[PDB]
Amino acid sequence: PFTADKGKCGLPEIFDPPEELERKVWELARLVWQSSSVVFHTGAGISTASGIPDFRGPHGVWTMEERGLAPKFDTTFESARPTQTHMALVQLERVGLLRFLVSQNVDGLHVRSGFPRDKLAELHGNMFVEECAKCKTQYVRDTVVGTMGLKATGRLCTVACRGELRDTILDWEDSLPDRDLALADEASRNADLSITLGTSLQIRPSGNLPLATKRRGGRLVIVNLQPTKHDRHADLRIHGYVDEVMTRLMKHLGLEIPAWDGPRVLERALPPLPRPPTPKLE
Amino acid sequence: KGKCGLPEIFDPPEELERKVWELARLVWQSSSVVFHTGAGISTASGIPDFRGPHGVWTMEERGLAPKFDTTFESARPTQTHMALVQLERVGLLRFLVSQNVDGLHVRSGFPRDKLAELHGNMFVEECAKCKTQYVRDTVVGTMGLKATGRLCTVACRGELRDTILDWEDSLPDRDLALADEASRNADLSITLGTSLQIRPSGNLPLATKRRGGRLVIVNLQPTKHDRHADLRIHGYVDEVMTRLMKHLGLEIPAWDGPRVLERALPPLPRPPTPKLE
Ligand SMILES: Nc1ncnc2c1ncn2[C@@H]1O[C@H](COP(=O)(O)OP(=O)(O)OC[C@H]2O[C@H](O)[C@H](O)[C@@H]2O)[C@@H](O)[C@H]1O
Ligand SMILES: Nc1ncnc2c1ncn2[C@@H]1O[C@H](COP(=O)(O)OP(=O)(O)OC[C@H]2O[C@H](O)[C@H](O)[C@@H]2O)[C@@H](O)[C@H]1O
Ligand SMILES: CC(C)n1c(/C=C/[C@@H](O)C[C@@H](O)CC(=O)O)c(-c2ccc(F)cc2)c2ccccc21
Ligand SMILES: [Zn+2]
Ligand SMILES: [Zn+2]
């Protein structure tokens, strides 16, 4: 809690220079095309471009705490817009180039971006979601659930039940949800490409799931401004703003990054849309 | 560098809700609305401000660095940026004055002939001879009005220089005159994300007061002229502008990607006006 191991905070940022950045995002493009089963793992770095501070970056929550300073929010959780990266992941899932998405974020922007819930594992919970203690029915609300650490919110289940509604925000002691951790674990083992965006991969086991892609010869790409726990296991490390890496990647894939309709909830992935034909790689 | 790192104020929801309704009334009641924007309308796209808690000057005074969560090239316009584009298209915004050099107003497709970029635009270089501007797709690599290395290509070969003013540099006369003219003639100035400490860029909203115009200030910190405002709103500008638009019955439009529009298009249809009192 107070004393919890918050891991390495405030490490130096690394910027790949343009030419080397340009060539790494082509290598990423080549890996996406070549792969049958692409899982994305996201952390707090995909939401900074929308005004929400990270945990272990230069100006992150834990970093500034060690220095006796406050993290700063440039928006509310309710007024946060999904980033170019968020929407990019929405399109990649609609054209069938993303099998599964595993996010350690509680900021709720994945769900709000319209990404389908049955293809998302929210390992650390969601600030807009409360859950019936009795029947496990989840409610995706339009404002943040007012509590953290899996406590009574004040509201009751309304299914065909009256059970106690509770927040989904894990405390330090709280084990991951079983459904999300099994679906994230299964997707990770079976993938032949895991890509990590904006996570420093220091948390167990959320950070270890990308290593499961390595077993049976799968490839691993790490996109991050700072060093990550598992940098040495990566076949490709890109050091750049994820928005810049994801817009350049989409351009290579010949994909437009769609308009954000405003807050929308999609329970179940739709049928896959048409996608460009694949380049000849050799 | 003026007063930096002042405490933030948050209006409570009920009060915030009420003030943005009072904003909505003033927009509807007003013949000629000008908006004045500063660094605060780009924070939510990952570009730090100057005198906010984590801003350039603040962090300098405390021997710390300002943090960028994007490049200038990869920055997307905020919900506020795109709201100003729609307000202009439906004829409820006469003019827009910005102290921002971040280039996002132009890239949002807001029309140049209705914008004054008082402190310059990092994506614009200007011919020293014929004053032809070039809006490029990557930041012009200099600041302080220096030669960039590139030449005029008009029907000229003159020296292209950046448009970023240094401290000593006088504002561009065209942009300052148009900004000043629009400010005097407006019956509503709204300021969004500016602390209004810079001369004269910060004083232009006060010219709206002369001949009984109204002034709204939307800002998280105190501003120089809080005392002259008929309405002060302490909230995230994005929240204020999305709630405001919702009252106006206006969608906030999709961003096509970087686009340059020289001249304002014909005004589009807008919802009918409420009966006010
Ligand atoms: N715009 C950007 N582009 C690319 N990388 C970025 C950007 N902004 C930040 N980063 C990088 O993004 C990385 C973010 O890493 P961390 O801050 O540790 O977040 P987590 O999601 O891994 O934290 C996991 C859990 O830990 C907590 O306890 C909670 O329970 C969280 O769920 C940094 O290395 C940045 O350099
Ligand atoms: N999301 C937000 N919502 C509302 N207000 C905000 C937000 N983020 C920041 N603010 C406020 O936004 C304000 C930003 O104040 P300053 O940083 O002085 O920006 P300027 O444009 O007025 O500076 C003018 C010139 O001065 C420089 O030298 C350069 O020349 C500039 O061009 C703060 O008061 C924040 O509380
Ligand atoms: C002013 C504007 C173009 N301008 C500068 C630029 C600021 C600095 O290069 C000059 C300043 O430090 C010294 C002086 O006062 O003359 C920065 C900026 C600040 C810190 C940073 F790490 C990178 C860029 C900046 C950021 C957002 C908007 C406008 C900005
Ligand atoms: Zn129930
Ligand atoms: Zn010329």
JSON list of C-alpha atoms in Angstrom, two decimals, chain A residues 81-94 109-110 112-115 243 246 250 256-261, chain B residues 76:
[
{"chain": "A", "resi": 81, "resn": "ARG", "atom": "CA", "xyz": [-10.71, 11.67, -25.77]},
{"chain": "A", "resi": 82, "resn": "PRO", "atom": "CA", "xyz": [-9.16, 8.46, -27.13]},
{"chain": "A", "resi": 83, "resn": "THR", "atom": "CA", "xyz": [-5.76, 9.04, -28.76]},
{"chain": "A", "resi": 84, "resn": "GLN", "atom": "CA", "xyz": [-4.84, 8.37, -32.44]},
{"chain": "A", "resi": 85, "resn": "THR", "atom": "CA", "xyz": [-3.38, 5.09, -30.96]},
{"chain": "A", "resi": 86, "resn": "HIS", "atom": "CA", "xyz": [-6.76, 4.12, -29.36]},
{"chain": "A", "resi": 87, "resn": "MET", "atom": "CA", "xyz": [-8.66, 4.57, -32.61]},
{"chain": "A", "resi": 88, "resn": "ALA", "atom": "CA", "xyz": [-5.85, 2.88, -34.60]},
{"chain": "A", "resi": 89, "resn": "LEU", "atom": "CA", "xyz": [-6.39, -0.30, -32.48]},
{"chain": "A", "resi": 90, "resn": "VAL", "atom": "CA", "xyz": [-10.17, -0.03, -33.17]},
{"chain": "A", "resi": 91, "resn": "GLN", "atom": "CA", "xyz": [-9.57, -0.14, -36.99]},
{"chain": "A", "resi": 92, "resn": "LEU", "atom": "CA", "xyz": [-6.87, -2.91, -36.76]},
{"chain": "A", "resi": 93, "resn": "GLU", "atom": "CA", "xyz": [-9.48, -5.08, -34.89]},
{"chain": "A", "resi": 94, "resn": "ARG", "atom": "CA", "xyz": [-12.24, -4.29, -37.47]},
{"chain": "A", "resi": 109, "resn": "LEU", "atom": "CA", "xyz": [-10.83, 4.89, -23.07]},
{"chain": "A", "resi": 110, "resn": "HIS", "atom": "CA", "xyz": [-10.58, 1.49, -24.83]},
{"chain": "A", "resi": 112, "resn": "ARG", "atom": "CA", "xyz": [-15.27, 4.35, -24.74]},
{"chain": "A", "resi": 113, "resn": "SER", "atom": "CA", "xyz": [-13.41, 4.24, -28.14]},
{"chain": "A", "resi": 114, "resn": "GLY", "atom": "CA", "xyz": [-15.86, 1.49, -29.18]},
{"chain": "A", "resi": 115, "resn": "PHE", "atom": "CA", "xyz": [-13.30, -1.34, -29.10]},
{"chain": "A", "resi": 243, "resn": "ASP", "atom": "CA", "xyz": [0.84, 8.06, -31.82]},
{"chain": "A", "resi": 246, "resn": "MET", "atom": "CA", "xyz": [0.88, 4.00, -34.92]},
{"chain": "A", "resi": 250, "resn": "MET", "atom": "CA", "xyz": [-1.40, 2.58, -40.32]},
{"chain": "A", "resi": 256, "resn": "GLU", "atom": "CA", "xyz": [-7.41, 5.28, -42.25]},
{"chain": "A", "resi": 257, "resn": "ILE", "atom": "CA", "xyz": [-7.71, 5.93, -38.47]},
{"chain": "A", "resi": 258, "resn": "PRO", "atom": "CA", "xyz": [-11.44, 6.41, -37.89]},
{"chain": "A", "resi": 259, "resn": "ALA", "atom": "CA", "xyz": [-13.48, 9.25, -36.41]},
{"chain": "A", "resi": 260, "resn": "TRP", "atom": "CA", "xyz": [-14.46, 8.87, -32.70]},
{"chain": "A", "resi": 261, "resn": "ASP", "atom": "CA", "xyz": [-18.30, 8.96, -32.56]},
{"chain": "B", "resi": 76, "resn": "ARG", "atom": "CA", "xyz": [-3.97, 16.14, -32.88]}
]
